Design a protein around this ligand. Structure first.
Ligand SMILES: C[C@H](NC(=O)CCC(=O)c1cccs1)c1cccnc1
Ligand SMILES: C[C@H](NC(=O)CCC(=O)c1cccs1)c1cccnc1
Ligand SMILES: [Ca+2]
Length: 223
């Protein structure tokens, strides 16, 4: 996250870190045994880390649970990034508490102008690289479809939305992918892609979770 703030320990209780020897992506806990992330975060050997603040220090609220299965969306296209969503099942259910909690799926799609919370452990620099150890947060509005398409001609599908600031300076970045965009207490987006980070006229692009609620519910119900 570039241009954000320190969230505070466990103030984003649905945020997970995906670890394969190291943090590589975020995710969102949506019930005691399932996480939503980005399809482009797929790999084998995932351990889900819940209750994290500093990802390099055991602070006492973590739960580390290996994945039993991952399910990439059937229509994910890694070239276009359309349908950039996957589900990860935990081998055992997380113990839910105030610091490890699921986030509700949306009942409706959020509109341009809605203010949301984006979070992650990604790079905090638009030029160069610095990672944080603690979770970072950014408040940002959803942008209109027309301004998103104007920013990225020929690239924005009906399964994507932009959020952030056309002036630049505040954005998601490398290592935030797969993490949450939460608006009014519902998971509306997944950190997906952009052109660099925090550049002028290049806001972050996010998977539009409301389009996937049926797929998520039906997949969970049979897996
Ligand atoms: C205490 C604060 N609560 C809110 O911001 C609620 C309201 C909220 O999410 C948003 C308002 C505008 C965009 S998003 C908080 C908690 C955790 C992390 N950072 C801040
Ligand atoms: C630049 C960064 N990531 C991407 O644009 C997608 C990266 C991508 O598809 C892949 C990486 C490895 C295999 S596939 C980003 C993230 C969030 C906001 N702004 C920029
Ligand atoms: Ca930790």
């Amino acid at each position: 996250i570039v241009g954000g703030y320190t969230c505070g320990a466990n103030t984003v209780p649905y945020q997970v870190s995906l670890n394969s020897g190291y943090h590589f992506c975020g995710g969102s806990l949506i019930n005691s045994q399932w996480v939503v992330s980005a399809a482009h975060c797929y790999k084998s050997g995932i351990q889900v880390r819940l209750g994290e603040d500093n990802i390099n220090v055991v602070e006492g609220n973590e739960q580390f649970i290996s994945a039993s299965k991952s399910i990439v969306h059937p229509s994910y296209n890694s070239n276009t990034l359309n349908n950039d969503i996957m589900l990860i099942k935990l081998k055992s259910a997380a113990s839910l508490n105030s610091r490890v909690a699921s986030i509700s799926l949306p009942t409706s799609c959020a509109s341009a102008g809605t203010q949301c919370l984006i979070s992650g452990w990604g790079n905090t620099k638009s030029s160069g690289t610095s990672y944080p150890d603690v979770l970072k947060c950014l408040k940002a509005p959803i942008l209109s479809d027309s301004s998103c398409k104007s920013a990225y001609p020929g690239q924005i599908t009906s399964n994507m939305f932009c959020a952030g600031y056309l002036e630049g300076g505040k954005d998601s970045c490398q290592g935030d992918s797969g993490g949450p965009v939460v608006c009014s207490g519902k998971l509306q987006g997944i950190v997906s892609w952009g052109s660099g980070c925090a550049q002028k006229n290049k806001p972050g692009v996010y998977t539009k979770v409301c389009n996937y609620v049926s797929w998520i519910k039906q997949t969970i119900a049979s897996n």
